[PDB]
Amino acid sequence: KEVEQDPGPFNVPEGATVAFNCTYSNSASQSFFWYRQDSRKEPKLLMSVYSSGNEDGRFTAQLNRASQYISLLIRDSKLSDSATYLCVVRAGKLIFGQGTELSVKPNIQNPDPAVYQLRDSKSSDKSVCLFTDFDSQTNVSQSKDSDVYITDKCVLDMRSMDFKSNSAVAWSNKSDFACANAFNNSIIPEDTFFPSP
Amino acid sequence: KEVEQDPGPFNVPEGATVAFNCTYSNSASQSFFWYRQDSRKEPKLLMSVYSSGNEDGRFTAQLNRASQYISLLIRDSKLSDSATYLCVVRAGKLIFGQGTELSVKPNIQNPDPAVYQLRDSKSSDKSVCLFTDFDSQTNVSQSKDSDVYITDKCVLDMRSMDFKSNSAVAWSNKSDFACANAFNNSIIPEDTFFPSP
Amino acid sequence: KEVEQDPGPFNVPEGATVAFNCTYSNSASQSFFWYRQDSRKEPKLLMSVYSSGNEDGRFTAQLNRASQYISLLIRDSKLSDSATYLCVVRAGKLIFGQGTELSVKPNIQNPDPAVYQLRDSKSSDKSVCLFTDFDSQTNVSQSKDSDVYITDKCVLDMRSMDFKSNSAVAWSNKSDFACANAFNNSIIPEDTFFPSP
Amino acid sequence: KEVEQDPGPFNVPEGATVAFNCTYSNSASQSFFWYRQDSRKEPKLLMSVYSSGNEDGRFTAQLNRASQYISLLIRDSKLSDSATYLCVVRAGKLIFGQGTELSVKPNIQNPDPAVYQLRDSKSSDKSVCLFTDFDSQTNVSQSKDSDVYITDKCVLDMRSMDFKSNSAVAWSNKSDFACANAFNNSIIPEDTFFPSP
Amino acid sequence: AGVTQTPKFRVLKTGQSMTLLCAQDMNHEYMYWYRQDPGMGLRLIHYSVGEGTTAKGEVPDGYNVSRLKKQNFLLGLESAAPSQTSVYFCASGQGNFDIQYFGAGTRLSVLEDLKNVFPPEVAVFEPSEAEISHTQKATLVCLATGFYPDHVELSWWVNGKEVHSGVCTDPQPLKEQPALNDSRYALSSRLRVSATFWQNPRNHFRCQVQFYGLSENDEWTQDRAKPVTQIVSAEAWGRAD
Amino acid sequence: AGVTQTPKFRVLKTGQSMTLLCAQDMNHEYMYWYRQDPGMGLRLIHYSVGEGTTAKGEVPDGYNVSRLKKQNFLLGLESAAPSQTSVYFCASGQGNFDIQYFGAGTRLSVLEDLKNVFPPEVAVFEPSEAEISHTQKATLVCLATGFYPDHVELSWWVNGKEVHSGVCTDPQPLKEQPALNDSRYALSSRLRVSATFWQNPRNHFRCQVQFYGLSENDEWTQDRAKPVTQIVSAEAWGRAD
Amino acid sequence: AGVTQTPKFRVLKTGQSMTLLCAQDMNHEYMYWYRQDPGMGLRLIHYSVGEGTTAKGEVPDGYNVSRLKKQNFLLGLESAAPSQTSVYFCASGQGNFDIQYFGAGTRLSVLEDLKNVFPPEVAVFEPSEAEISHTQKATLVCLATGFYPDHVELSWWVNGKEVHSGVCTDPQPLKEQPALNDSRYALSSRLRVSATFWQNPRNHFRCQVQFYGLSENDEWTQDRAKPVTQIVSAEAWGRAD
Amino acid sequence: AGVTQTPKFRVLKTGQSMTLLCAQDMNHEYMYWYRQDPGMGLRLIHYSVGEGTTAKGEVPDGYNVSRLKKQNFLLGLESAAPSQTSVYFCASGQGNFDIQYFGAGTRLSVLEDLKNVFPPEVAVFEPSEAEISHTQKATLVCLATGFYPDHVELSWWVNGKEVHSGVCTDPQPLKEQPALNDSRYALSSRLRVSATFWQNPRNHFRCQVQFYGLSENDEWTQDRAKPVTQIVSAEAWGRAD
What we know:
The complex is a heterooctamer, with four copies of chain A and four copies of chain E.
Chain A: E1 3-5, E2 18-24, E3 32-37, E4 44-49, E5 59-64, E6 69-74, E7 83-89, E8 95-96, E9 100-102, E10 114-120, E11 128-132, E12 148-150, E13 156-158, E14 163-165, E15 167-172
Antiparallel strand pairs in A: 1-2, 2-6, 3-4, 3-7, 5-6, 7-8, 7-9, 10-11, 11-15, 12-15, 13-14
Chain E: E1 3-6, E2 9-13, E3 19-24, E4 30-36, E5 46-48, E6 65-66, E7 74-76, E8 87-93, E9 101-102, E10 106-111, E11 124-125, H1 129-135, E12 137-147, E13 152-158, E14 161-162, E15 174-175, E16 185-194, H2 195-199, E17 205-211, E18 230-234
Parallel strand pairs in E: 2-10
Antiparallel strand pairs in E: 1-3, 3-7, 4-5, 4-8, 6-7, 8-9, 8-10, 11-12, 12-16, 13-14, 13-17, 15-16, 17-18
PDB class: immune system
Keywords: T cell receptor, immune system
Assembly: octameric
């Protein structure tokens, strides 16, 4: 208790605006802050929240001492904004909320999703199925099997081509699964192209 | 698929502002709308969204045919805004979002929780317990027993007196249960008042 | 008489707090409201005034039925707050006040008063002189000459730079007044830049 | 400059509520005070102002370290509140602003503006004229001739009979004038008594 | 005026055949019939465009339709069956698939055995003195229990006049036997007024519950009383106690 | 959504009739009409309590009323005439004289003669280099003059998109003949930009003033163009100079 | 207890010198000497942190200080002159520059020629019978004229006692010469009483005005009498007249 | 400049002691030691406000702190044990409990047995040609399996140059036995360049993974090779293939 905060994750399109609200319980509170924390490093200040309500700059934070809540508004989202946001209230000795994660998702112009098969250097062959390109709506999840490891999607940016694309990876000991029956337990697109030879 | 919308419920302090987002897969979609739907009545048009961006009024909505999303921004909330908000997209045959729910909570000025017992007319008595006046942050969950019944908090409003209060109820076929033990599966204030005589 | 209310225009600095007053004669009045109304459009409700005083949020309002007074407070002004504020008293059929105008004047931080000449497109030229970037200690006045028209100070918000300038415009029937003698009728900062070429 | 405070005199109706505003320029000022100074006597502390905002009691003090504003607030002012209010800042060496003068003006509920003539004791008889019992709505101004004298209105409280009166005096050196023409240089009500007998 | 849809509630036995009237006022060309279930948006069941049209959405199973009068789009069903038990909404707009206006809505329950249909059993509980003397305020609580389906409408009446300030009915009926998919429901509502008002014992406090169960020409063969569309209510007069 | 009120503007001559529309979406029950004039608070003209009411407030002169539908409350004047020229606001309420929602407003000018209705002359003034070479910020002025009455909507259009950021339009029009009771108004407006932006010749600046003059069914015999609803506009391109 | 400060009033001639006694009871360690003037708040002149201190605030011209005892912080001007005419406030301080406590204050006046010092000419005017016979209230007016400077304290005395109920005095003297800087001032007071009261003839009314001018040992060569500190009075008994 | 904190990663056997350094180049007076765990904000352990100060938050277990100098706040555990395994941050403040400048952090793992500390197997998989003859761009993937704890830092190196342009590493390490309290961790990364740039054989690609395990003087008995702070990497040259 003491300090509650927007729970589950905000997953929004790059350009949307986002709203965070935090409610404290003690009226005596003296100062209020919004902190930003990339995963998984350190809380770096973001906003000092004042009763006067803020102005600059793209970000906006206000205090409502009466209703005992502070707010944060991020207009015109950006990938970089993707983090966990922290409510801090100086209740005599400063309380920290457990924060709300924001994952700004980029838009893929031409989504031609696929699942290729990279082969190990050195030797052994092993196996890695690469799911990449797909649009930010596609959502990747675990596998029914435990010996098949699956990583959550991951955005990638080639600076000198302003080209960004999503990416997800899954692997398992030569059991021997293929890159066609990989993410069987996830909701893949209807146009996923599978190369075999 | 087709039209995706913000997931879980948005519970928010009354003065606050809210952010809504809608994704549409079909690129060549033609018309866009937001619809407010109280519970549990019918859809009522709210906005029509254009690429020009809107304005009227306390409300803002915008269309980015680019990223293929539309958004709704409700600022300066009111208890009345409590309803389910629905993205509608004209894709040659018009798709309806599944909707995203908004519950606007009233920030309680003078919060003094209490657990009274109201006796019944006629006779037999049975008895019901009333949980009222706790803060908006507090949560009322069901009970361990299958024969005892509890209702989730319910905001009451007394216009004349400029006074809003919360309120939940609990009752049962004499176990015999009481008010002392009533909401023990719920996290109640460390000062909640329990009469007796 | 009847619903009386603070007279003329309140010109207040961006950070200050203001007090609106309004007196009502009919002792038996039932309910009270403040409505805000932006130049130049409709009245929008702001506060329902009750005896126990109100709460949220940056805005305070209270009623003293004894002295028959209705007060409104905006702490921590914004420019957003410029508008006309109306005392509305029920007492049978609800009487509308005449309202009081608030003109939140902005706080300049790096002011270089200047008067430039803007030269018409098309042709003919006519001639417009531009007073600008003076702080709020400055007062623009009408013109001695009637063939010369001068608009009162107007405030600007270059949003993408959190920059705010003042400005006032003047022009006439080529008499042929130059930019220097334009505001002779007004009190100009001792150091106002004047370019002629 | 430095510590600045609301300019001139505040002339406010005996029931109205007032706002004082003060600004400091040293970002790192430590403590903040309002001192009250009665006319014409010495400063005494009124309150210490805190970020959280004061409390007691009809007298309200607010501070804002962000905007660097201090504000004092008198709700439902009384006549006994007339005084010069001093904003004091602890910026290394305790600073005293010039302060602003409050001048609560009485509520004359049942006014009948009369002009009587008092006959002197002793001898000479000179000539004294009493303008009295006008509501605070009517204003008084000096005189045209400089052989005749005209005081500014002064406020009187008959505590025992809770009767507050509003009087003004005029006298001249055998010119010779009477109580009818005495107060020509002022907005005199249509219904002013003039007993010459 | 506006857009009026009838009925509001209805309880059907499998293999029966009712019809939904959709009245329209705006002199609109296009009309639609929707179907709203937990977990999805609306799903078009049918539509029309002038006086002869049908088709889209997903019409199986037995949804025949009809647009005789330009003002009235009749959705029907000649072999009612679960599913179909959902919340229907007629709608209209002059556009095409554009801005459109909805009807209040029909909440239909289609069963196979009307045996487990029950009228509610309202009851009023009077404020606790504990409360009165502490809040200087009294809350009455109404409770309707053991009714199926959840086709009810709870309202308070004070002095023969229905109030809406100071009230608060549950958004959602509570299950008594959460397990049994066809459980009897239960609802609560709180009406709170000043401690002065309740005190005065000439003030009449009536809790009203409208229930929409069986019809008149509905077979009924149970020992108990036909659970027909009825009103159940409970009174309570103010007390100085 | 809300309360729509038509029209936004109008110019009548003494003796012509017309009707203002006020549409209520919220299914309220109470509806009012007000009149707004300098120095005085809103004064009620008429009102309705259900679907058939009128009467109080102050109705002389020609202020007739209607409410056949309930969502629509009309206001008519069968015989216009100065005065009657003022800003009209319709309103809506679920209460009675509780809280009410206002419409955007209607601004009506009644004239015994339409010869003095003029349209505005827009003109755009390029930035002074003195300013640019000192402030590194450029400022455009757009002037609208000679227009009567003040039924206008000035806007800045930067490369085909209307901008608000960086503009400041006067709160009130000006008078070129302070004496005369029917003076031609003026209005100035300022748009400011980063000098870099202004020197870019691919950046386009358009000033645009919507006028709301005479309607079609209106006599007009003066030598000059009938002053009807038109859009005057001045423009300029980015001087790399 | 508290903080005492002397003198209260005083007049000097440019060149003359004097001292301002400020004693402190509360055993504080900080002491200050401020200077108040029109158009600017309190200005500091000197202070002391212990029992051997001086320096800041601003000191020129001849303001010299002296703190030996600690309970006593002495101020003096070796050679007076206008300016220097103002009100002086001594102030005691416990800790640092935190809360501070002030003496009643002193009103020094420095003139380069005493020739234009004058005492007041009090005088009481009896209630206009017109008033008692309309308001049923009687209003006496006192009048003090010809004095310089405004070193006055006026007071109403009813039956050998002072009264504060129902009295009103001009807050600021009235220059009988809106021209001259050393113009002679005038002041007026008012005492309203129930008609019946005045009518009582055993009731005594006294208008007291103390004046603070010259002293015993001051040079004086003007024909007229010496303008020394004194208490001028004007009386009137209750007429049943 | 900056508030610096060290070490960045660490492992201790239950009972063994250590000390964390918070250094502040900012001449601040207030310093703090927080603990950060999942499902809860930060938590205060101690905080100093000068040079002799300590206090609150949740001190047990073995958390002592020292502040001999102002630049440095030293937190120390005397008998480490699980719990105590988490992530430590420390903050400097020029205010009281005002704006707090944190340090990079310290991820400490406390194991009562060093046996289950394993280094990462690093494998660089080469781009499937399909990708090239379809997307005309290559993607080099990199894995890191069977390591504990998750104390790692992964990077790519194109020809003696670390690169970020065109990369994406899992923000959080994966668990191989998700239902074990001490699961072996695995981590993936991605690198993508223009297809042409892949064929080029003078191009060299390297996946450098910093591990952070055992220290020098740690009691190692296990058969396997002492899991110490090391670097593991995998390579792949340019294939015109």
